[PDB]
Symmetry: D4
Subunit: 179 residues, 8 copies
Amino acid sequence: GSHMEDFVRQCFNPMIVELAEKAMKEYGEDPKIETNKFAAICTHLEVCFMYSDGGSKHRFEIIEGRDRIMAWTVVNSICNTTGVEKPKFLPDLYDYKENRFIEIGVTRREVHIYYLEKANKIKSEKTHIHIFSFTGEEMATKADYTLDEESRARIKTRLFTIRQEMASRSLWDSFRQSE
Amino acid sequence: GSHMEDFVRQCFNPMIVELAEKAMKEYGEDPKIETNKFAAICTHLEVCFMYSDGGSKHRFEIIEGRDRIMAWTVVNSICNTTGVEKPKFLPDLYDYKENRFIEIGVTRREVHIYYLEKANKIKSEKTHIHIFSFTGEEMATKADYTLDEESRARIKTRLFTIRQEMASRSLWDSFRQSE
Amino acid sequence: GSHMEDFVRQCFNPMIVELAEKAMKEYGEDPKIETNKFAAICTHLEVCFMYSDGGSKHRFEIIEGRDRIMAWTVVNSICNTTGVEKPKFLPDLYDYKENRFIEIGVTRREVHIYYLEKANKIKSEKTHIHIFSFTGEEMATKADYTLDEESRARIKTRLFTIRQEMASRSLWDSFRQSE
Amino acid sequence: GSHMEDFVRQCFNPMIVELAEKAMKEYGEDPKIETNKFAAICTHLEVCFMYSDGGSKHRFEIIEGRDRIMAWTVVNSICNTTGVEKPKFLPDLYDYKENRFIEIGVTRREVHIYYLEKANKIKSEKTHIHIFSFTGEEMATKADYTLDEESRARIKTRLFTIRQEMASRSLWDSFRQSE
Amino acid sequence: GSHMEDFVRQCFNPMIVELAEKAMKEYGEDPKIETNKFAAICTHLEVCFMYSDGGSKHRFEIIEGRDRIMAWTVVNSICNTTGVEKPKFLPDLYDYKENRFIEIGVTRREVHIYYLEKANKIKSEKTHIHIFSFTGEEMATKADYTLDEESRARIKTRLFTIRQEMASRSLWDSFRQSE
Amino acid sequence: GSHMEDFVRQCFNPMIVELAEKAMKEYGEDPKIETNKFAAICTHLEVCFMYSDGGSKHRFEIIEGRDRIMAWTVVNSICNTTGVEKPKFLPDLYDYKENRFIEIGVTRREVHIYYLEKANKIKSEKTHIHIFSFTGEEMATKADYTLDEESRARIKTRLFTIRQEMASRSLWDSFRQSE
Amino acid sequence: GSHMEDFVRQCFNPMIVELAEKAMKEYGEDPKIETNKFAAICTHLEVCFMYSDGGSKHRFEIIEGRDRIMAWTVVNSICNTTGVEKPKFLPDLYDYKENRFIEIGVTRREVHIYYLEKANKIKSEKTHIHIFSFTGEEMATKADYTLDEESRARIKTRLFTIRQEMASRSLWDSFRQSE
Amino acid sequence: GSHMEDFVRQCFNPMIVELAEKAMKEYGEDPKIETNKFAAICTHLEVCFMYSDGGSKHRFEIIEGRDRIMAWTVVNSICNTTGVEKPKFLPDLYDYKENRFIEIGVTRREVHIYYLEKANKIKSEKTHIHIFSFTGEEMATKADYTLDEESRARIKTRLFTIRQEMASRSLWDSFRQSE
Ligand SMILES: [Mn+2]
Ligand SMILES: [Mn+2]
Ligand SMILES: [Mn+2]
Ligand SMILES: [Mn+2]
Ligand SMILES: [Mn+2]
Ligand SMILES: [Mn+2]
Ligand SMILES: [Mn+2]
Ligand SMILES: [Mn+2]
Ligand SMILES: [Mn+2]
Ligand SMILES: [Mn+2]
């Protein structure tokens, strides 16, 4: 029974917490144990949701937060629809405005180290990359940040008020060393 | 008890499935038997709904998915309102922006054969024609596709993820030979 | 027990029917008896609602369908707020975009006779006037129709599909002679 | 058991009344006793809510109506996010469009006396100031009123219809002398 | 704008207040004016509802709170169904357990004076009579109180907590002199 | 467009009206045409629902108002479960308390003629029979009326208030001659 | 930011947690600080709710969890209704079956020490007393436990599964020393 | 993509299907693969739910369908509460009326072979055992079937209508050979 298991349950939305439990258990982890990654994948889920929420009402297509098999199914459908190269690892969104997939990251290092962790794994980085941080910075491909200046500020404000409430419970430092 | 009767029930929205059952029974068919056309008229209904959803909030007027008599009633009302020629077969939508009716098709042939099946039956093609396909192509009158580029991609992505889930159950090939 | 009492109940929205009953009883009439004016004030209510619905989300202020005293209260508040002359009879809407009140009419004569019935009663016609008809015409002050071309077509289409369903029950002719 | 305790309960929205009770009790007052300030902080809450409602869907961030500690938490998060000076007293909103905090006032004096009460207390008035009145005037920093002309008229119309219903119960004069 | 108009709105359930407004206006009175009888018919409605609630789930048939015409319609239906004498004034309930109509009263005199006011008007008192009071007494025909001892205590407790909240606002004495 | 089509829509519950439309169309009839049988099968449905409602919470199993195939499926399941003879025509309910099927009738003749119409068609009347009437009588097998005296009175009261509202619209006499 | 503040939020029902916050703040305490008594008054609230839930549907009258003033108001109403001595400290329930008030306790000592803490403070113990414990014992006046044997077991099972989840987070021992 | 994966999704309640997916994945199985046990644990869940539903409103305590850890937590709480021996394998219910745990089984063999599979594994069969079957038989400890005769018939009727719909799709025989 961890302090942060409770904080994750009380902090995020019940649907997001349920999807995080499902994804973590599908890839072999216990939210009651690997609690730091529990908070991480909750945060990642929420950031992706607010991202797809920013912009037009039906501009994005959510890939993260689905079943493995179904997420892939969507990716193949989009690929055949428009004519984009099938990604290598599962992306997080697809911009219909820019006809391109989007990988969303949330890290505790600088934008540079996280972007480096993601770009080489992307290899053929035919799909866009967008990083966020609990400090407030964001590195994105070709400095195209996709979203409005107001939607992105909302996301970082949220990222930081999470970091605050974690420090109020002396759980922030353990989160910083896990990544 | 057919496999695709279940797949149609689990795949589409309950309202769409109910309207498909109602329309098929009104024109003398059993969704438990003519199952391929069950999936077809479910798909047609859903595509029409997403179409009227794309664009402005109150830009389209749904004609398909109503009672025979009531659908006609609406058509006469629109006709008298604006001043457009009363169609010959029941159309699917009316664009208030373009002051014109719209016939929506979803086929398993090329855009050409379906468009040919529809245009001669339209005779006096005073009303627009718009075709869609499980491959991803679309033929439309005067190459005016009515909707935004992003709303139409959504529709075709959906059409294709349906085709996928059908192949996952070995039901796609039977669908292809029915049309 | 009249045929059109039932048709009015089954045709319009329950809230609109309830507000019509309330207004008619407040001004001394029985919806079970003066049934033609029952259908009339239902239609008037619905047309006003769709009107305030067309345009921006918070562009109009509904005056009809409120309590006598409260409706007036709103009018005084708007008057003091912007600086417009207090109307003489209770108006139906207020356009915040055009800073002007709006009187909405729905008649069975021509636009001319109804507009004449309303303008002289307006006397100091400082407030806008907008007429609608079951035929499909509309006369408005200075030929400024306030709303988009698509929102107004919706209203007239609705007005006409009502006229149809009335004729399907042989109740239209009695409606035409009541005005 | 005061007349205006009832009028406040019947006039405002239950959520707003509950938040007003919570804030007043947190800062040591009884809504059953300091009833004038009960109506005041209800009005202030509602005006702030309509303000954040005017404009874009996610343009503002509500600071008033939260817990003391949580409200501050949000302020620190916004501050770190964009890079604005941390206010001195707790502000009411943050404009993401204009990257600036907003203090909303509702007074019974002129715009001048209220604006004077707020500006010197702001000291380093790095954050915007916006006043409203039951008469209908509004003074704002640099004459930038932030919102559309139609959203602001709505607010003042509401402020005045409240003043009316108060006079209908002979409670307005007691409200005027409390400030 | 009366104090007790507000107290009635804030004290009773919105459906009960709406039905009271409807009945009072149907029999020619203004809840904003004849406010004491407003509170009275609200109380009468609520007492009848709790009465029909006490006992079995489908033991009673509500007659009060319906439209004049419809209430009568129900009475005729019950009369023909069982075989009971058609009442003279409109009763409030029908006990299916005891096969008898019930008239419910709520007074500010003693049980004796109210029971006397009701019995002679009943003339052929073929239907049961049940009185309640803000003091807590109850006179009933043949001392048959119909309901359980626990359901009736609930009703009187409610009647008295209303009398209290009225005294908290100095409105009780005006209520006592109106009857 | 019939008067009673409207009266049926406004009188019964939308679910019951929908199930009646479905059953009538499944057995080849138009509710807009065979309107008398529309009202009949609505009434039959409602009476069956109130019947299964009377008694214990899970005492009855509804057979009428289901799909043909599914209704039969249930019947076979009950038959195998308890050990009762499979009926010949589709029954309406099954009493789990009395381990016996129940056929519910609603007629405009006497209990005798309707009971005679049903018993010979039952042939091997191994299943119970229960008749109801718009007059208020009821004939049942072995004079076992299954339900409480209070639940059955409710049903007949409802049957009669329907007959009243029909006479208020001069539609009752046409109903009486159709059976 | 305490561990048990989170555990209390995630463990109990949001309404109960809100009422506990309200009562604690009304009697001058911070749920973010006096967290042990936060969990205590949450538990007390929940136990009282399940108690009033056990037994008949309308057998009990809830006194705890109301506003101070309103709770008293109810007590006076019950007192006048039945004829019971007005308690000295605010009781928790009133049994309408047994015509007596009930004080509910939940302690971490034995039933004896808690019962002793309550009885002398009751002085004139005209009202019933009922104790519960996280161990599972219960002392009650005259060994009359009021409720069924099954409703009381439910309460103690719940009390103990709370004690378990507290030990899973190493928060139980701090709870035991606070009383 | 299996036929019975679809049939399980369309046949059972979404909550039950979700809990079955969760339990199967927690004990290392894929509902898309071990589909027969998918239908099995769905059926087991539903039978347990109807069982706890039969009888008194709060007579049973559900153990199956919870998290492993939480289910155990409840068991320990009940054990300490009443004083029953802690079971060895996780039971399904606890009867508060009979103060005893209950293991529910649903098999495709005879009651004898399933009861034999369960009793020796129970070893110290201090807890009750209750078997059900798609044929309709039931073996229970000491021939005490716990529930009413009507609630148990409901369960078996449901078990058999499932077996029917499975045969309608030629999936029953594969289910019979899996156990
Ligand atoms: Mn990502
Ligand atoms: Mn089409
Ligand atoms: Mn008008
Ligand atoms: Mn402010
Ligand atoms: Mn009465
Ligand atoms: Mn039948
Ligand atoms: Mn029948
Ligand atoms: Mn207490
Ligand atoms: Mn207590
Ligand atoms: Mn089991």
